[PDB]
Design a protein around this ligand. Sequence first.
Ligand SMILES: CC(=O)N[C@H]1[C@H](OCCN=[N+]=[N-])O[C@H](CO)[C@@H](O[C@@H]2O[C@H](CO)[C@H](O)[C@H](O)[C@H]2NC(C)=O)[C@@H]1O
Ligand SMILES: CC(=O)N[C@H]1[C@H](OCCN=[N+]=[N-])O[C@H](CO)[C@@H](O[C@@H]2O[C@H](CO)[C@H](O)[C@H](O)[C@H]2NC(C)=O)[C@@H]1O
Lengths: 147, 147
Amino acid sequence: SITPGTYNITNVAYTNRLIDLTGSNPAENTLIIGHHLNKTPSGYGNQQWTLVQLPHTTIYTMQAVNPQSYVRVRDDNLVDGAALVGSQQPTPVSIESAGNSGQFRIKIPNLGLALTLPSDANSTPIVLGEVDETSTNQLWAFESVSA
Amino acid sequence: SITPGTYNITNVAYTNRLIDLTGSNPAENTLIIGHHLNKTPSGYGNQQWTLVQLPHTTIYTMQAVNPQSYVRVRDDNLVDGAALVGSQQPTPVSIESAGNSGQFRIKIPNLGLALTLPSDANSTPIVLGEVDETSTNQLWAFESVSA
Ligand SMILES: CC(=O)N[C@H]1[C@H](OCCN=[N+]=[N-])O[C@H](CO)[C@@H](O[C@@H]2O[C@H](CO)[C@H](O)[C@H](O)[C@H]2NC(C)=O)[C@@H]1O
Ligand SMILES: CC(=O)N[C@H]1[C@H](OCCN=[N+]=[N-])O[C@H](CO)[C@@H](O[C@@H]2O[C@H](CO)[C@H](O)[C@H](O)[C@H]2NC(C)=O)[C@@H]1O
């Protein structure tokens, strides 16, 4: 499973879209979106995500670098279509390798829902979607931010 | 939420019953059961459970002190009535205070299911049951182990 650490996380369908906390805004419910890289080599802090892992399981918290908002399903409403947002508290996620290259699904534990990017349009908010076998938009790649 | 550490866990409905790994058996799929305290004052290692926590969540792993088997739902079959067993791999659980005091429900994350002890007979296996706020069979007291 992915080692704890700090990553740029890019969509597999839309490889030029990173997970990005809108406007580096620390406010609750700020949306999390798919957005072009906003600074080389690894973006500002709002496109870097630190993963903390529960040993011997695939459960993690994801926290941005700056501001330090965690990834959270808005209002803890774990249903299809629900928005991902920046919050002072995280939603635990299950990050699971897809049979793939170094590709992963970021899943809501035990619900069969996953983070998806529904459009390549820049700034498209990321939402939950149903886990499936053929959609690449709920597939994600992780790249370490250089120390 | 509960502080990480090593605990004896006693049922609320049946106060002479602790979560216990059958016969201190290290084998996979060994039943977890309700059973009287097997040693004073904190039982042997099969009745002592170490909790590991993912910070800022209520998700945890539970592992016996000896042998070191984790608490796992049989075949990761997260449905009503499924057996709890020891395994080399854990089922992440959500340990949530049930108001009261020192009382907690050990729930399956995001599902309406929780560990429950259906009878005070010695060695009755612990199994998942639907979450039910009024049922003491799925309530648990946690006492730090002095040993
Ligand atoms: C609404 C908003 O936050 N707009 C801009 C913000 O302007 C704030 C003032 N008024 N408005 N109205 O300015 C930031 C910083 O330039 C800007 O942030 C970018 O937002 C995009 C999505 O639109 C993406 O999140 C970028 O990564 C982000 N860049 C930074 C550095 O935060 C925001 O859109
Ligand atoms: C038979 C065997 O291989 N193990 C038994 C063990 O046998 C001792 C030999 N016969 N004598 N006197 O005996 C213990 C009971 O003392 C037994 O372990 C207990 O099993 C129950 C449920 O069946 C429960 O898990 C108890 O906590 C457990 N106690 C300990 C200390 O492991 C074991 O199966």
